[PDB]
Ligand binder design. Structure first.
Ligand code: NAD
Ligand code: JUT
Ligand code: JUT
Ligand code: JUT
Ligand code: JUT
Ligand code: NA
Lengths: 312, 311, 311, 312
């Protein structure tokens, strides 16, 4: 098993670390910046020696070293700094994602690709358009983070472990997010039974939904850097589901093909991951739940189209 | 941390093994049979060395070596063979559980006690009666094992991982068991949505409930021995929830007083486990759900009474 | 990845369990006895669900289910009874291992094969002779058990963790065993420096070597069963080294090909395991160390010849 | 169990992460900079939920939150960049370590303290002087990191796993470092037997020793940041040895009192760690081995005295 990290920044390094702990494969740490992946590869080799992990680790600036990778994780791109519009970020990261898409097609066209670069809803669609890879072999990590935050906040309020708190959240981050209380459960027991027993109020659930929408910006405001540990953990879970053919269930950006009144777009949705890739499944929404999702989908459609134009 | 295994048979040894792998504590392996716990302790020490685990393991025939244990697992008992119900065993297992209860009261009255001997819900009530340990410090492992079977079978049929299939199963083993489809979910999605999508039929769910009830007897019939690995894993999860104060959610035999119309009896029910013990919670049941539960509770009540008389 | 357990007794089931915990592959539990592997497969599926493991487990009485296995673990064999001579055991387990060797050649000729049946030094040679598999793709598990016991006992006496106590022990179990104090170290520091500092005496080391030779029989005498947990851990380490191409270092039965004045025999020796198999290496022994090893090798040669004749 | 991280930078956060994965205890992430530990605590809580870990994590700017901590890890400092020696800072890191020493004495005087700040052997001596903690309750992580690099490189050359390559390295980082070939083994077999069999040459070993000395600076030069993963792993191993009373064997900065001719000083040496702390042991060195060690010790002695002056 060969795991290629396209981008050896904070998230890529931590995904490497978690792939080693968890013994998923040999690592290729790739970056455009001379020396960064070489340095991080040295650090992760020494880490491996202390913790009893025996996988090969290569840090490289040569894109051909991703040859025949089973797994591609794309964190390649920049952060938006002072003087940069959202449109300038989309142009720079979209050009980078186009170039990565071309390299994956050239060197490792049978890879399972996990897109992570921001803005995520857009950059997964950019990867698909320019990769010529099968839609089942592409996904974007997002929904697991939103689900993990929502479930951990519900668990805190009910004074229970988060281990058996499960929820479906459709769409993207922030305003794009569509959480389903009907598909939220605590070790099989619907959330509504806890409301009925006054262990949590509908106002507390609304407050938790707002904290969930805002969590990425809250971490950026406090740490002056975007989340890195939890994104890495979410990516590592998706890798493991593909490699071990697990059919684990996730909300991730996945290709809709008729599902939820949508085809020919990657969007945050209910999916399972196995060794054939990431496969959507449709559940019955109410009319109001589907109207909210269709609005999330229309925004992704609109922003993706704008991004293709910003890329010439 | 000191984890005392009262019974060094198949389940006790595998609980020891899983506690060493998870690094939960030092072990005391106790058994009435001279040499058995000493030999298994040697084996688990060599296993520890190969796997890089550092915990102490003592095998002993002296029950006072459980002194100041944090955790007690009781498997002291006989098992059922093919042709036998769980419920037949009450006479000899009752006397054994009474004697263990007396020793735990003497030597480690502040331990969290997980009872595993069959018949499970009866032997938990026997342990409470003769130990006088606090009600919340005593439980029985059953519901996690039943739940694991039911969730495995549902996951197989839906072609999904079992990791996010969750269910509430109330009551004891076999006919005593009350699984709740309404409190079964697949990553938050109620089971009933899968029925609606024709991914599983109500007949397939009934057949899975029957396989769940009969699983213990089926394993005994095939393997010529009762289940050991899954019971051990279920016990280890409950241990970890108590030791790390996790408030993990389980169906286990727990003391109900008022919950689900039940007075003053240990029976399989919804609970959480933290470092103060096992705490029951009551959920809103349907009339038919509560009638089935009440029927299971009445059978445990009746058999517990029979057991106290036999003892 | 497909891991085939040929033998679903105590050691095979625990190897299955540890392969699931380490997520090394899908399991095939094979046995000749109807129902045993089916029952244990049910138990290990339930165990998997409780611990969040997602691998396939098949219990089967049909040898063709081992088709294209990556890994074969052979525990197929009987236990020695009082009437049963060493010669009778060799005859029964020898015939079984010949049949397994033929089935592996037919169904999974690309497997890495770990032989575990008694007597270990003979039965690995029997597998090689009748399999027509490459010698690199075969090994026998023994030396790791002796090393774990010797290192645990040295660690106990020095009051240190066993994690960084390492030793080379050549040959087989009991009288076949050739431990090298010169290749024993505590986090890089030779054993002899501890003798020099009077933290351990040469008499204490000899006593530890005798306890190591006798450990198997001691566990049998206490537990009324042979070691199972530690053998399973040793086997799972060897599996992991092959599957993850680790080049981890072991004393295991490995084919010597000029090493230590020996070719054309499997014997316990210094080897590394990677995804191409099990490869010996030779280290410089003193004349006395090599004479002891050559005597162990002559005994394995002699017993293997006897076994081929009995078979 | 309460684990207090004094410093919520790259090493402290990854120590937190590894303590959560290993389930060692509840975490307190402390830092002087408002918001950084709060943001990283949120990230590590979400990480915990995704990986099925249940421990409490508090990020705080209030030093009194370290109260009754069982374990203290000190990374509070500034780091060296390329063009800087370890020993350069050292007035600012010394004042920081003095202030931490005072806080630990006030709030958690029964803690086991692992010092990590950057002139490592000096800052351990500073912590002892101003904390007055018992000598065996104070140590510094260094030797495990140097050992991991040396063992990794020997394992690479012999084409073996690093799992069973073990070595004693005495003294500090860089020129302070004294590796012992005589106390290097591969699964029990002395390194000298590999030289004898021409599997590795004395020149290859010298080159490996030089790469080991320079590795910190090499990673800084390539990754534009100091090593973080392997230091964190080395710290977590020491924490685990104390918490589980393991008597694991390490080189760490430890109080010598006659050992290896060293009087009343913390220096990199052979020690075991159990729940009573870090306990030094002396092995027989040759005259050349002891002369090199005494030279390393004299430099630490000299620089510690200089550091106390820079602190006035
Ligand atoms: N999807 C989510 O939910 C989620 C959560 C948080 C962060 N993120 C995003 O993930 C991305 C990475 O985050 P990070 O903290 O690891 O960022 P980073 O800046 O730490 O790392 C990105 C790396 O990509 C490299 N890179 C730049 N151009 C490249 C090119 N042409 N080819 C290859 N590599 C190139 C950079 O040199 C850098 O090392 C960002 O876009 C961030 O916004 C997404
Ligand atoms: N193919 C199938 N997928 C699911 C499922 C998938 C993703 C989810 F997020 C979910 F909640 C259920 C259930 S069956
Ligand atoms: N005290 C509380 N218990 C629960 C709970 C307990 C057991 C269960 F089986 C469950 F599903 C929820 C949620 S809050
Ligand atoms: N095949 C090879 N083995 C070693 C080595 C092997 C086994 C041992 F047990 C050992 F102690 C060193 C170095 S290369
Ligand atoms: N008390 C004891 N310490 C050791 C020892 C300690 C540290 C080492 F680094 C070592 F190589 C041996 C051996 S016995
Ligand atoms: Na207790």
């Amino acid at each position: 098993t060969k795991i290629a990290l396209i981008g050896s920044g904070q998230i890529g390094a931590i995904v490497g670390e978690l792939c080693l702990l968890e013994n998923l494969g040999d690592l290729i740490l790739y970056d455009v910046v001379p020396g960064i992946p070489q340095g991080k590869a040295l650090d992760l080799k020494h880490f491996s020696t202390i913790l009893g992990v025996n996988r090969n680790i290569l840090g490289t600036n040569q894109i051909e070293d991703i040859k025949d990778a089973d797994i591609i994780v794309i964190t390649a791109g920049v952060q938006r700094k002072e003087g940069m519009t959202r449109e300038d970020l989309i142009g720079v990261n979209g050009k980078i994602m186009k170039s990565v898409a071309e390299s994956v097609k050239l060197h490792c066209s049978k890879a399972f690709v996990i897109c992570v670069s921001n803005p995520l809803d857009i950059m997964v669609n950019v990867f698909h358009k320019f990769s010529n890879l099968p839609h089942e072999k592409i996904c974007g990590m997002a929904g697991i983070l939103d689900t993990s935050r929502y479930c951990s906040l519900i668990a805190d309020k009910l004074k229970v472990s988060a281990e058996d708190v499960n929820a479906v959240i459709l769409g993207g981050h922030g305003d794009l997010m569509v959480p389903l209380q009907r598909y939220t459960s605590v070790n099989g027991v619907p959330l509504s039974e806890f409301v009925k027993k006054n262990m949590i109020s509908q106002n507390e659930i609304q407050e938790i939904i707002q904290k969930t929408r805002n969590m990425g910006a809250e971490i950026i405001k406090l740490a002056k850097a975007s989340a890195a540990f939890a994104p890495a953990a979410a990516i590592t879970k998706m890798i493991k589901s593909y490699l071990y053919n697990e059919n684990n269930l996730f909300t991730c950006a996945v290709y809709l093909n008729g599902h939820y009144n949508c085809s020919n777009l990657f969007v945050g949705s209910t999916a399972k991951i196995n060794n054939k890739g990431a496969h959507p499944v449709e559940f019955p929404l109410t009319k109001e739940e589907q109207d909210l999702y269709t609005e999330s989908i229309a925004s992704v459609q609109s922003n993706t189209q704008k991004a293709f134009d910003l890329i010439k």
